[PDB]
From a paper:
[name] is a JmjC domain-containing protein, present in both the nucleus and the cytoplasm. Building from an extensive peptide-based screen for potential [name] substrates, our results provide evidence that [name] is a JmjC-hydroxylase, catalysing the stereoselective C-3 hydroxylation of arginyl residues in sequences from proteins involved in chromatin stability (RCCD1) and translation ([name]). Consistent with previous reports, [name] residues 174–416 fold into mixed helical and β-strand topology comprising seven α-helices, 13 β-strands and 3 310 helices. Like most 2OG-oxygenases, the [name] active site contains a metal centre, which is octahedrally coordinated by an HXD..H motif (H321 and D323/βII, H400/βVII), the 2OG oxalyl group and a water molecule, which is likely replaced by a dioxygen during catalysis.
We therefore pursued a site-specific 'disulphide enzyme-substrate cross-linking' strategy, which enabled us to obtain four structures of [name]([name]).Mn.[name].[name]([name]), [name](N308C).Mn.[name].RCCD1, [name](N308C).Mn. OG.RCCD1 and [name](W414C).Mn.[name].RCCD1 as cross-linked complexes (Complexes 2–5, respectively). Compared to Complex 1, single sidechain conformations for the target arginine residues corresponding to 'productive' (A in Complex 1) and 'non-productive' (B in Complex 1) orientations were observed in Complexes 3/4 and 2/5, respectively.
Author numbering: 182 to 416
The structure:
């Protein structure tokens, strides 16, 4: 089953049919006019952010043993992990780039739907997710609502309800208890047999689209192209 797509639903419709019951949806016609949609290119990103230091995750998946985190400039990240035939997967993941670079904040907008939350606009966390084709964020859940906005490229996204948590075999450790032990796209069904029958939603999220990921919904994300997404974590 595919995540439903709705064009600019009213605040009330979003609240009653999606936010309150905790059901995912893709919102169209909302972020398609961010300036970012037309302005953000590798060249623009280099011009505005190239000299700044960013954290970069190196390795296929953050659950891997060889996975690590390092620091480099945005120019270095683009050169080593996007443009030149990269040797390893690098991902500028989960970074508050817009607090670091306020000029880029002018190219985005917080969706009006976030004002249905009980939290302060000031406390919404805005993260950049910028990387090559093939980045993977393993199946995990977050403690706030999320609007994940796709700017450049496409992502394949799989969503499992919190009701299905048993079939997802969360890690026992404290660092990883919000992360599944299962590789979604190649699950070990001898070790994790309950995963096979667990229902899910999926989508390909394209530029200009917003995915609403309800609080605690399990999500898995693979970039299909050079990709730039912006998430808003809110309550
Ligand atoms: O985009 C990705 O790779 C992963 N995104 C998230 O987990 C998020 O926005 O919370
Ligand atoms: Mn997440």
């Amino acid at each position: 089953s595919t995540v439903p797509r709705l064009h600019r639903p009213s605040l009330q419709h979003f609240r009653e049919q999606f936010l309150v019951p905790g059901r995912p949806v893709i919102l169209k016609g909302v972020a398609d006019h961010w300036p970012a949609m037309q302005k953000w290119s590798l060249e623009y990103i280099q011009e505005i952010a190239g000299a700044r230091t960013v954290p970069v995750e190196v390795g296929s998946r953050y659950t891997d043993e060889e996975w690590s985190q390092t620091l480099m400039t945005v120019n270095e990240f683009i050169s080593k992990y996007i443009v030149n035939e990269p040797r390893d997967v690098g991902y500028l993941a989960c970074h508050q780039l817009f607090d670091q670079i306020p000029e880029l904040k002018q190219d985005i907008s917080i969706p009006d739907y976030a004002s249905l939350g009980d939290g302060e606009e000031e406390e919404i966390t805005i993260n950049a997710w910028f990387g090559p084709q093939g980045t993977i964020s393993p199946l995990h859940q977050d403690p706030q609502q999320n609007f994940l906005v796709q700017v450049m490229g496409r992502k394949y996204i799989r969503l499992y309800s919190p009701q299905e948590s048993g079939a997802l075999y969360p890690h026992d450790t404290h660092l990883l208890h919000n992360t599944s032990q299962v590789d979604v796209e190649n699950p070990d069904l001898e070790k994790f047999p309950k995963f096979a029958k667990a229902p899910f939603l999926s989508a390909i999220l394209s530029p200009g689209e917003i995915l609403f990921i309800p609080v605690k919904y399990w999500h898995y994300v693979r970039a299909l192209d050079l990709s730039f997404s912006v998430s808003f974590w809110w309550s």
